[PDB]
Ligand binder design. Structure first.
Ligand SMILES: [Ca+2]
Ligand SMILES: [Ca+2]
Ligand SMILES: [Ca+2]
Lengths: 23, 132
């Protein structure tokens, strides 16, 4: 689904920030 | 449990004005910031059918989504569509998205400290807020 995947795209970058913060 | 908070942070980035609803214009600015160029997106998540997305509807869509999602993410970041994400294209999307989350974090810090827009603090209140 391109729709939820578009919403998921921002969530993935946001989670990469959070995972990089715990380091 | 802790995933709901992460979803609320993803929701608050779209909900810039903080009224608790994601409008079609608020969804459009983030998509344009990712390099993309809409009504069906909002209607696909709106369960109550008022034309806007509240957080409970956003939670259901994001929880129901949890392979193909990462491919769509790759497509959004691959701006020129050459099958690769270059250094500039990764930096651009993460700088745009990172700066927007920083802005949301700033607005939450200002609201939490009681200023909440159009407010002010004197030197004594500034010291108390900026220390401890
Ligand atoms: Ca709003
Ligand atoms: Ca709704
Ligand atoms: Ca590329």
């Amino acid at each position: 689904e391109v729709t939820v995947g578009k919403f998921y795209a921002t969530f993935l970058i946001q989670e990469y920030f959070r995972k990089f913060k715990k380091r | 449990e802790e995933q709901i908070a992460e979803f609320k942070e993803a929701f608050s980035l779209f909900d810039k004005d903080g009224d608790g609803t994601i409008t079609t214009k608020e969804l459009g600015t983030v998509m344009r910031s990712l390099g993309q160029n809409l009504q069906d997106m909002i209607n696909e998540v709106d369960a109550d059918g008022n034309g806007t997305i509240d957080f409970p509807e956003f939670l259901t869509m994001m929880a129901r989504k949890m392979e193909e999602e990462i491919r769509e993410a790759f497509r959004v970041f691959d701006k020129d569509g050459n099958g690769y994400i270059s250094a500039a294209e990764l930096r651009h999307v993460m700088t745009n998205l990172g700066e927007k989350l920083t802005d949301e974090e700033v607005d939450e810090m200002i609201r939490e400290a009681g200023i909440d827009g159009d407010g002010q603090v004197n030197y004594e209140e500034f010291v108390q807020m900026m220390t401890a």
